[PDB]
């Protein structure tokens, strides 16, 4: 038991005009089997987001050991720490490093940093200094650019729909850290909280002028895209004479305000942050987020837009194929552990195949999700049908060899007799047929002889129908009457033999069809129960989203912005389709 986790690390890195993944960053990611809590700390540079990280990572003095371990490190940076309050969980921190630096060109990669941070996170701490004013809001144009950078779903029957209307269901909670905040939180001579300050700064200017759609765009975006909103204030960490020397200070000398505000913020982020989940209540861990990062960033560098749906579908297909392999492996252990190499009846074997198919489809259903078109269940069905056919091939060969060997053992002597001549005397017909029958009645007796017994035997005697036909005519003790009677009885015999042969073959083909039908029954039974739960999840999630959409339309209405609550009305309809 170690699963040791490393120090801060490049995950994405902006170079030239290209986004770049760290293959070791992913290599660490692929090792956290535990459910993760991503907490992005996003902020313009020189506002000390990295401090917030450091203390959230459990560093004693966060002012020390800056995340800028090197220079020219523009991009998203990762920290992986065991979760201090959620046991068996690992907290995953993210930081935006160079956000604001003017390098070569239009530098869109900046807003890409922003978008990507949102997509990957399950709590999104945006960090700014000062007070929320016109300038703070202008720097948040990253949020007014999201309808152009994140598509939530592909667009078939979606032209009449607003894609951004769907952001609420998978975006992280939004938390605004305002640092170096020296504002008495007073309304009209009465006190207010930090959240109260946020809600006050998130109100709208009436009008429709350019000057006023501009004022409202960012803050409509914040109240419409994120599910929760918290604000935390921070007083400067020391008086001015210490501001260039925070590292050399001990906790006893920091403004007791900062210290406290920092304790409140850390306790909150630690207890109320949630495991990043995907549509359908899917807890996300390393191997998952790893492909999330891959899919999204690879979309960005190919000239396309990140899209929650393509990404989660790709994830689904990976996990689902894993389930196919898990299931066929369960199957094969259980086949190998309860089959008689030469099967007594064909029914015994199809019945075992059916039991182990039952359990393998359970293993599948327990490890799979979003299997659209049932494509993977059908892959599993084909794989088990091919394993069943192959076993049947081996079984027929097993029984055919068991009988074909015993055929020298019982019938061998008799061939010998036909060369030594035992049957060349008067009365030889009656000597051959009667022992022939004795031995035949002996071969039948052998138990567990398996299925292709009646076929193997009969083929051999078709070889030897003519040795007795030859003897019947060359005997000298029989009359012509008797030879005629016997030709008639051998016709009858063959007749009953062919009849019973056909009756076996129909019996076998009917068993085969029972089995096919009941395997298909077991597939639908399990699949419809699975879909009855998956729909239950989707119901719960879509109800929570509806409630949030109502609260915000009622807030827009009470503030007196009916037009906005009307747009949001169109959004509620389309949720109920």
Swiss-Prot record:
Main EC class the enzyme belongs to: hydrolase
EC number from the UniProt entry: 3.6.5.-
Annotated residues for binding of GTP: 43-50, 179-180, 243
GO aspect biological process, one term: cellular response to type II interferon
Keywords, ordered alphabetically: Antimicrobial, Cytoplasm, Cytoplasmic vesicle, Golgi apparatus, GTP-binding, Hydrolase, Immunity, Innate immunity, Lipoprotein, Membrane, Methylation, Nucleotide-binding, Prenylation, Ubl conjugation
PTM comment, free text: (Microbial infection) Ubiquitinated by S.flexneri IpaH9.8, leading to its degradation by the proteasome, thereby preventing its ability to promote host defense against bacterial infection.
Localization, UniProt: Cytoplasmic vesicle membrane; Golgi apparatus membrane; Cytoplasm; Cytoplasm, Perinuclear region
Entry GO CC: cytoplasm; cytoplasmic vesicle; cytoplasmic vesicle membrane; cytosol; Golgi apparatus; Golgi membrane; nucleoplasm; nucleus
Cross-referenced PANTHER family: GUANYLATE BINDING PROTEIN (PTHR10751)
Function per UniProt: Interferon (IFN)-inducible GTPase that plays important roles in innate immunity against a diverse range of bacterial, viral and protozoan pathogens. Hydrolyzes GTP to GMP in 2 consecutive cleavage reactions, but the major reaction product is GDP. Following infection, recruited to the pathogen-containing vacuoles or vacuole-escaped bacteria and acts as a positive regulator of inflammasome assembly by promoting the release of inflammasome ligands from bacteria. Acts by promoting lysis of pathogen-containing vacuoles, releasing pathogens into the cytosol.
Subunit structure: Homodimer; homodimerization occurs upon GTP-binding and is required for the association with membranous structures. Heterodimer with other family members, including GBP1, GBP3, GBP4 and GBP5.
UniProt family annotation: Belongs to the TRAFAC class dynamin-like GTPase superfamily. GB1/RHD3 GTPase family. GB1 subfamily.
Protein name stated in the entry: Guanylate-binding protein 2
């Amino acid at each position: 038991p170690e699963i040791n986790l490393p120090g801060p690390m490049s995950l994405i890195d902006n170079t030239k005009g290209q986004l770049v993944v760290n293959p070791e960053a992913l290599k660490i990611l692929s090792a956290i089997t535990q459910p993760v809590v991503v907490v992005a700390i996003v902020g313009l540079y020189r506002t000390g987001a990295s401090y917030l990280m450091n203390k959230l990572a459990g560093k004693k003095n966060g002012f020390s050991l800056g995340s800028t371990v090197k220079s020219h490190t523009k991009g998203i940076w990762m920290w992986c720490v065991p979760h201090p309050k959620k046991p068996e969980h690992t907290l995953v921190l993210l930081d935006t490093e160079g956000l604001g630096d003017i390098e070569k060109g239009d530098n869109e990669n900046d807003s890409w940093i922003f978008a990507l941070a949102i997509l990957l996170s399950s709590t999104f701490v945006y960090n700014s200094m000062g007070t929320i004013n016109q300038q703070a809001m202008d720097q948040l144009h990253y949020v007014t650019e999201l309808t152009d950078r994140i598509k939530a779903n592909s667009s078939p029957g979606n032209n009449s729909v607003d894609d951004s209307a769907d952001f609420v269901s998978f975006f992280p909670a939004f938390v605004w850290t305002l640092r170096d905040f020296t504002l008495e939180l007073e309304v009209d001579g009465e006190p207010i909280t930090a959240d109260d300050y946020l809600e006050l700064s998130l109100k709208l200017r009436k009008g429709t002028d350019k000057k006023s759609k501009s004022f409202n765009d960012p803050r409509l975006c914040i109240r419409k895209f994120f599910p929760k909103r918290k604000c935390f204030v921070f007083d400067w960490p020391a008086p001015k004479k210490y501001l260039a020397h925070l590292e050399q200070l001990k906790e006893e000398e920091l403004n007791p305000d900062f210290i406290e505000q920092v304790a409140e913020f850390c306790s909150y982020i630690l207890s109320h942050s949630n495991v990043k989940t995907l549509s359908g209540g899917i807890p996300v861990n390393g191997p998952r987020l790893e492909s999330l990062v891959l899919t999204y960033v690879n979309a960005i560098s190919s000239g396309d837009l990140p899209c929650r749906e393509n990404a989660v579908l790709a994830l689904a297909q990976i996990e689902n194929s894993a389930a196919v392999e898990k299931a066929i492996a369960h199957y094969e252990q259980q086949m190998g552990q309860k089959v008689q190499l030469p099967t007594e009846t064909l029914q015994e074997l199809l019945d075992l195949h059916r039991d182990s198919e039952r359990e393998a489809i359970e293993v599948f259903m327990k490890n799979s999700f979003k299997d659209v078109d049932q494509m993977f269940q059908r892959k599993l069905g084909a794989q088990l049908e091919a394993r069943r056919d192959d076993f049947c091939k081996q079984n027929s060969k097993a029984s055919s060899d068991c009988c074909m060997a015993l055929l020298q053992d019982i019938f061998g002597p008799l061939e010998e007799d036909v060369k030594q001549g035992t049957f060349s005397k008067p009365g030889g017909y009656r000597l051959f047929t009667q022992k022939l029958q004795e031995l035949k009645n002996k071969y039948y007796q052998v138990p567990r002889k398996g299925i292709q017994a009646k076929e193997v035997l009969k083929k051999y005697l078709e070889s030897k129908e003519d040795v007795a036909d030859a003897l019947l005519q060359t005997d000298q003790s029989l009359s012509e009457k008797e030879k005629a009677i016997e030709v008639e009885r051998i016709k009858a015999e063959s007749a009953e033999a062919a009849k019973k042969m056909l009756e076996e073959i129909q019996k076998k083909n009917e068993e085969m069809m029972e089995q096919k039908e009941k395997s298909y029954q077991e597939h639908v039974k399990q699949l419809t129960e699975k879909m009855e739960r998956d729909r239950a999840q989707l119901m719960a999630e879509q109800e929570k989203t509806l409630a949030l959409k109502l609260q915000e339309q009622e807030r827009l209405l009470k503030e007196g912005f009916e037009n906005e609550s009307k747009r949001l009305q169109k959004d509620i309809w389309d949720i109920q389709m």
